[PDB]
Sequence to fold (606 residues):
Amino acid sequence: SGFRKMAFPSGKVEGCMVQVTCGTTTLNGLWLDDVVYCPRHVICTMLNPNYEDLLIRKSNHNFLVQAGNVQLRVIGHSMQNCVLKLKVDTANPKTPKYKFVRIQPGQTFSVLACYNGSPSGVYQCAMRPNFTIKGSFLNGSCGSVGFNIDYDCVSFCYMHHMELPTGVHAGTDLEGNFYGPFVDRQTAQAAGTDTTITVNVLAWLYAAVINGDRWFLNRFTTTLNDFNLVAMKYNYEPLTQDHVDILGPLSAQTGIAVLDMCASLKELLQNGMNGRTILGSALLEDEFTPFDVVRQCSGVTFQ
Amino acid sequence: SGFRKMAFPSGKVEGCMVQVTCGTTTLNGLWLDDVVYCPRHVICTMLNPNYEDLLIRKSNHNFLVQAGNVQLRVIGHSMQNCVLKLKVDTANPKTPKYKFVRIQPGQTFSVLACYNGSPSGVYQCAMRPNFTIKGSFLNGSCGSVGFNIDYDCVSFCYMHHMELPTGVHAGTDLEGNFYGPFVDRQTAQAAGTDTTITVNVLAWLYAAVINGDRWFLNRFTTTLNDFNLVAMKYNYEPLTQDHVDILGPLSAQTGIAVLDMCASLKELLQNGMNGRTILGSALLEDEFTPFDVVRQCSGVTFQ
Ligand SMILES: *[C@H](O)[C@H](Cc1ccc[nH]c1=O)NC(=O)[C@H](CC(C)C)NC(=O)c1cc2c(OC)cccc2[nH]1
Ligand SMILES: *[C@H](O)[C@H](Cc1ccc[nH]c1=O)NC(=O)[C@H](CC(C)C)NC(=O)c1cc2c(OC)cccc2[nH]1
Fold:
């Protein structure tokens, strides 16, 4: 019993973290096979950089790459969108089975926060509809990564580049393409309007039911259309039928049809919890996907 | 910027997790040097076990220990309080620098939840004043461990044995001694009355200030005595001067004396947040120690 915001075991990713220094800037890189991936702004010195030019100047030896104590000789270098790829003379023996994936807003992943090539800690978070994440990142964390694990395969989805004036965070996929409309410039860039991930809240309510919190379960039902109208008023993402279907397995487990839970959520948005808590929380939690709930409640393990 | 409930990187502990089977029961063990530590109730078959007797029957070969794919030959076995120690013929090459510690209520640690010797995920939690933890543990998780990391040293403090009727969790230190008044019997054991960790709430308020949430900061001050009276009414641990001193460094950082923050908390207990949030939360968070705050806000890393 019990429901926690659980992160993936981090060891497979820990074994890939390195430190990358160019001139005076040091940030984190990701060492897979004989390539180190890192954010390209390590070659900055930055209000508007011309990264292709800065890279003509730079030669391999200008990149100091340290894997713990060991220095790794850079024998080649290239750029792909906003990430630098440093070919090194040594393949990482701890490289896991891996993919690069681009996630969708609403999906979750674990962040391994690193400084100077060493891990500080791990937590789970959601890609917000506005393509930001509400993380815990200080200066020097750039190049920390986000990931999911599927059995033995690490799917890297996020590399950290920037903190916005709002104090939320923004970065790229491992092909260097930013999530959302940001650029890797030392300029102030505004977020974009966020909304709550409605399908995730419903998953979290099924998790509550599975654990034992049911007070919020109202006797009524509703239509997808009617619900999506009450949602718009409270800044909630529209629920699609793809979402309704993703919730089917939880619905079948708990004996509660999706539209009934939709009724029960519709109430909460209108009356609040009146001092009550769901799974130890007093706000409606939207950073658990339906998969996350099934994983945690089923004891799914990795390898 | 940003404050998350961050767990320790789990890789050092991942490298120690093994599967232990006796007859039909399989749970998790901790492999350090040539010893595997696990909960002794793996030799049960359980309403009131006589563990010393069951162990006379058992011979080494009766313990099936698997480290991933590899079987580890048990060449000796012994009990220490509620944990079994299985000497194996092979020393774990991934053993980290480590200590066994017994933590104090109010302190925090990370849990690496495992099943069948494999990790499911990692999260941070607090030892409650009543010596329980509010975890996420299913049947078969027993032998999962809790730990802290200090640079390169893993300090193991918790091994999981039981879930109480309340659905909170209870276990031992790595010397097999239970936290709180529980026993490893298949019986229903009641918790004991819990309270909120007052020093941790204050740390969490300094964390808020450090990040930018200050609305709750009242202009008044108060005495330790006066505050501890308002606390008792709301089921809050008494704040001692040892606690006040542990908060000194945060106080010095933020320019806010400890007793002033005590005034500002005294209000919240009396008026609530009136629909407002501190660090994205609408309840007063008590699972961050003062150290946890400084670690996270300072970028402290491990190795
Ligand atoms: C890389 O380690 C850091 C990450 C970081 C810095 C500070 C706080 N939290 C963090 O996570 N990245 C950067 O510093 C960016 C460097 C590159 C992409 C140019 N810069 C920013 O993230 C940044 C820059 C600015 C301004 O510059 C005018 C203005 C306002 C906000 C801002 N954020
Ligand atoms: C070990 O893997 C499990 C852990 C566990 C089981 C179920 C749910 N969450 C969990 O974390 N431990 C056990 O099953 C204990 C076995 C040993 C210590 C005997 N048993 C319990 O934790 C337990 C036993 C009971 C009752 O037995 C009459 C009654 C009520 C609650 C209860 N908990």
In short: The longest strand of chain A covers residues 153-163.
